[PDB]
Chain A
Amino acid sequence: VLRSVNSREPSQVIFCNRSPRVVLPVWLNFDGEPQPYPTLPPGTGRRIHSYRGHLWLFRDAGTHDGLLVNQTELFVPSLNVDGQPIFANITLPVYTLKERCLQVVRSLVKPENYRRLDIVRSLYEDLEDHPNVQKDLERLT
């Protein structure tokens, strides 16, 4: 369902990482498989060659936490006007306090030890159910 269209019409894009995370751009290929691309350090940008109708999303490279691009989940390169590239502004979401706490806890506790934490079983499940692109594709479908 969610997949890039094989349009063959070039579109030049700037991936602009305005987050404090290392960014993993993910291209959804013509069969809908996520293809990872080179990472972007915090605050950096890359001018890249993509195509109209192609689908992209953006993740924290280390944790797979979800990021926004032009304020939304998916970015689709448009027609370039006057030879100008399309800007893809990658930013942090306003995470819920719960998701933000899960992130921090996941960053300090090796997954084998989630179970040693003194919390209700459902929070163990929340920790183990870490962000993943496949899960988000099944949702977004």
Chain B
Amino acid sequence: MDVFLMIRRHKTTIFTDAKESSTVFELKRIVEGILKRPPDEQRLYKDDQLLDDGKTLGECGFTSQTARPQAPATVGLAFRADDTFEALCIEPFSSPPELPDVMK
């Protein structure tokens, strides 16, 4: 079963899918192919929880019926600069303006 994700760090957002049975480590390999950083320089998160490489995306709560094409689940990403990892930072998207009067 496919799960649909946004992998997010700072002002970067990757739209991709993976198998529910695929591992956290395998997702780092996907990230590696796109952003050119190896798995050992990556930490992946679900909310504030650091994800273990060996676990499946399903085990970590990314399921086909919650990580949907039209409403994908968010995976947090942090990079290691030199010796130590940066803290997890995900820049929020911009805020919609006030609803125009005629839309109330």
Contact = CB atoms under 8 A, between A and B. Distances in A.
Interface of A: 105, 108-110, 113, 116-118
A109 B101 CA distance: 9
Nearest to A105: B103
A118 B102 contact: no
Interface residues of B, number: 3
A108 B101 CA distance: 11
Interface in B58-104: 100, 102-103
11 contacts: A105-B103, A108-B103, A109-B102, A109-B103, A110-B102, A113-B102, A116-B100, A116-B102, A117-B100, A117-B102, A118-B100
Contacts of A113: 102
A26 B70 CA distance: 30
Given A108-B103, A109-B103, A110-B102, 8 more contacts: A105-B103, A109-B102, A113-B102, A116-B100, A116-B102, A117-B100, A117-B102, A118-B100
Contacts of A109: 102-103
A12 to B, nearest CB: 35
Contacts of B103: 105, 108-109
A109 B100 CA distance: 10
A105 B102 CA distance: 10
B102 to A, nearest CB: 4
B57 to A, nearest CB: 26
B99 to A, nearest CB: 8
A117 B103 CA distance: 9
A116 B99 CA distance: 13
Contacts of B102: 109-110, 113, 116-117
A113 B102 CA distance: 6
Contacts of A116: 100, 102
